[PDB]
């Protein structure tokens, strides 16, 4: 029972014992695997009263009991080292709100776990056995504050934490000191997304991606996730989406697809908006609103027309939901964009239309702001036309070519450049059986 | 080495390669270590001479040493269709295999047998049988109680003379009246 | 710092040990590709005719000769199985004497042939 609970952890420690003698890939991925199966046993009734007794005994095990806080009494230096650390890993696991509610207790514990005899020698030894999420995933909760008077001061524990993560960013020595890292960024990112202005993300950019391989595509996507949101008000759209496009593409998430990928999708949906593309939410009908899309759809629904009021109405309606996702900042722009979009379409299809007939769409809307409004539109390209008011003729271009240009062959080049994608990758993985079969 | 490699690797003439391949195990002497892993590349070849050239340089570096690993590399090459090829492999291994025998190294029997096998075999060549009988008597040289040493960890120091006999004998089926040079590295236990 | 000096140092050897190989390869690459060539040119025109009888196995079989010779020979390593065709007029070296290739079906022997009007000239009516 607690036995079997312990027995599982015995296997974990037994697999920790694998890593203990130089064997992570087993251990970590097992620990990874263990992290999931961790939900099973969970709790910590006799698992720990039997753990703190099974392993060995250490001062910190005592200070850990301050987190335990209970009564058992009863009767009943090596193996009890990183196991204890690996259990401090599970300590954090005992903190999930699994076996906890207020980790603000555990906050200090975390430090008092993190900082002492830990966050010390571990550079290549601990391999992302740090979970700074599960470090912060704790603090994540409490950042429901509100309450804290943030934090302490303002809010320095987080500033500290940032600096502490910074204190890791040093510790990210790239000795392999990586994996967990840009969660730190991601934290800081979402910390920006909490308050700060990401743009130092550019510095965070400037450092790195979570290099590289063994990082969870999840994070690597979650990397992109915020990293998308960089370009959000960085107002790069593709790349933002490309992140999403590199995030949802192969980030592995079903359980976490649920609330969390919606988020992704939300901004993702928000992307094509940035481009005014309005894909068919005909899919985004599905696994969406419910709780995510449909305002986006309403947006799309509006953005299909981009009818400012009807547009605004959605916003008018969903602003809080927007506000809930802070996609509100968006769309304030695509308003006239779609207006200008329509302006472009089923309309520019003459080599003109007039001033006033194209002004008619503005005679539908406004006048001689047209001049601006058209220049407003022409300004961006995003249409191609000309005018002369001296002509009063809003002169709407071809947009007509052939592939005479290198334009296709650009794409061919684009295709060409990709010729190495799977081709060079085949060699990227050629190794593994081929090389391990030698073993 | 790297030069020597590609030089060997690239070159038209085999025995060049072969010898160049062979010559490797000298500049490569001090580490026999990866030499098998090295010649493992050339353990495989389209070309025997390659696979010929292999045997020596490897069989050289471990002559006074171990690595059944290195050895066992060559055992298929002891079966490499050309007796001349394996003829080396016979010798080459036996160069390693004096004093090492008998459940310390069991396979020696086979090896010795394989000689005898070959030596008995009428259809194994006097390429094969030759090297075998030699490789046999190699293991048996100086009443079999004597060893083969170069860059002698006893001293830690090279013996040019230890080298020479090989290099001498290197060309032989070229010029048969040679191998007697091989007596150099013969070393007392 | 130190035992690396022992330890660490030794691994540039591996660095090197790695390095060599591609070289060998590129050669070997070329090696095939140059060797690869004549492998084709093994084939050549001044061949003889026979009738494929039957494979003994892949790149083996009994066939016919226009001399009636039927012997264990070789065939296309070009073809395989589904590629290999169980009775065929065939292409044989004289001396290497092996199957160079099938002959897409022969027709006109005796018999005394067949009517062949390919696109007849007559419209009806």
């Amino acid at each position: 029972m607690a036995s079997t609970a312990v027995m599982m952890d015995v296997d974990s420690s037994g697999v920790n014992d694998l890593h203990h003698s130089e064997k992570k890939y087993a251990e970590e991925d097992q620990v990874q695997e263990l992290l999931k199966v961790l939900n099973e046993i969970s709790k910590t009734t006799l698992t720990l009263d039997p753990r703190y007794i099974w392993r060995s005994l250490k001062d910190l095990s005592s200070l850990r009991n301050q987190e335990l806080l209970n009564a058992e009494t009863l009767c009943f230096k090596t193996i009890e080292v990183t196991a204890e650390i690996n259990c401090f890993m599970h300590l954090l696991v005992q903190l999930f709100l699994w076996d906890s509610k207020e980790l603000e207790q555990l906050v200090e514990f975390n430090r008092k776990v993190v900082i002492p005899n830990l966050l010390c020698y571990y550079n290549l030894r601990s391999l992302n056995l740090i979970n700074a999420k599960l470090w912060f995933y704790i603090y994540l909760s409490h950042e429901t504050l509100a309450r804290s008077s943030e934090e302490i001061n303002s809010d320095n524990q987080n500033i500290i934490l940032r600096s502490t993560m910074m204190k890791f960013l040093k510790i990210a020595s790239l000795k392999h000191d990586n994996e967990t890292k840009a969660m730190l960024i991601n934290l800081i990112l979402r910390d920006f997304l909490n308050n700060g202005e990401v743009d130092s993300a550019s510095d965070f950019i400037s450092k790195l991606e979570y290099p590289h391989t063994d990082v969870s595509s999840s994070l690597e996507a979650r990397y992109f996730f915020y990293l998308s949101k960089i370009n959000a008000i960085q107002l790069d759209y593709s790349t933002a989406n490309e992140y999403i496009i590199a995030a949802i593409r192969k980030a592995p998430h079903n359980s976490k697809s649920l609330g969390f990928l919606q988020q992704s999708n939300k901004l993702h949906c928000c992307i094509q908006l940035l481009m005014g593309d309005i894909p068919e939410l005909s899919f985004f009908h599905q696994s969406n609103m419910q709780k995510s899309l449909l305002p986006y759809y309403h947006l799309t629904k509006a953005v299909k027309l981009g009818d400012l009021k009807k547009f605004t109405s959605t916003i008018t309606k969903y602003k809080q939901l927007l506000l809930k996702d802070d996609t509100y900042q968006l769309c304030v722009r695509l308003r006239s964009n779609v207006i200008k979009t329509g302006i472009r379409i089923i309309s520019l299809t003459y080599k003109k239309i007039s001033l006033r007939d194209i002004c008619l769409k503005l005679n539908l809307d406004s006048e001689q702001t047209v001049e601006y409004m058209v220049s407003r539109a022409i300004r961006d390209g995003v249409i191609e036309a000309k005018i002369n008011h001296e002509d009063g003729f809003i002169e709407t271009t071809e947009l007509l070519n052939i592939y005479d240009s290198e334009d296709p062959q650009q794409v061919f080049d684009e295709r060409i450049k990709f010729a190495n994608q799977l081709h060079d990758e085949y060699l990227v993985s050629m190794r593994y059986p081929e090389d391990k079969k030698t073993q | 080495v790297k030069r020597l490699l590609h030089v060997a690797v690239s070159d038209s003439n085999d025995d060049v390669r072969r010898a160049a391949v062979i010559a490797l195990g000298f500049v490569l002497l001090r580490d026999y270590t990866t030499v098998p892993r090295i010649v493992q590349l050339l353990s495989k070849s389209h070309n025997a001479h390659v696979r010929c050239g292999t045997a020596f340089a490897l069989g050289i570096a471990c002559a006074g040493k171990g690595l059944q690993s290195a050895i066992d590399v060559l055992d298929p090459l002891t079966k490499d269709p050309v007796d001349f090829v394996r003829q080396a492999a016979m010798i080459a291994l036996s160069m390693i295999l004096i004093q090492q025998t008998e459940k310390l190294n069991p396979q020696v029997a086979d090896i010795n047998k394989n000689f005898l096998s070959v030596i008995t075999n009428k259809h194994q060549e006097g390429l094969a049988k030759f090297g075998a009988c030699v490789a046999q008597g190699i293991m048996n040289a100086g009443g079999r109680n004597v060893t083969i040493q170069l860059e002698n960890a006893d001293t830690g120091t090279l013996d040019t003379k230890s080298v020479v006999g090989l290099v001498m004998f290197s060309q032989f089926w070229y010029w048969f009246p040679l191998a007697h040079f091989l007596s150099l590295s013969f070393t007392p236990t | 710092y130190f035992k690396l000096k022992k330890l660490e140092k030794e691994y540039e050897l591996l660095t090197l040990q790695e390095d060599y190989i591609k070289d060998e390869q590129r050669h070997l690459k070329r090696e095939l590709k140059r060797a690869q060539e004549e492998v084709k040119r093994i084939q050549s025109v001044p061949l003889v005719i026979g009738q494929f009888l039957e494979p003994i196995d892949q790149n083996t079989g009994i066939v016919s000769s226009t001399t009636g010779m039927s012997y264990v020979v070789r065939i296309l390593s070009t073809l395989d199985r589904e590629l290999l065709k169980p009775s065929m007029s065939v292409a044989l070296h004289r001396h290497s004497n092996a199957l160079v290739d099938i002959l897409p079906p022969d027709s006109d022997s005796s018999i005394s042939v067949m009517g062949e009007n390919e696109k007849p000239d007559v419209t009806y009516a």
Binding site: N123, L124, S173, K175, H176, L427, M430, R431, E434, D435, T438 | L41, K44 | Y1, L4, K5, L7, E8, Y11, E12, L14, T15, Q17, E18, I21, K22, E24, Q25, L28, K29, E31, L32
Partner: peptide, 28 residues
Amino acid sequence: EQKIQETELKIRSKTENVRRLEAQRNAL
């Protein structure tokens, strides 16, 4: 120091495409 240390990891990581080309030499 640890300077000297993970310098290996490069070589350590290097070890490999190598062994592909190893398979490649084979594959050739």
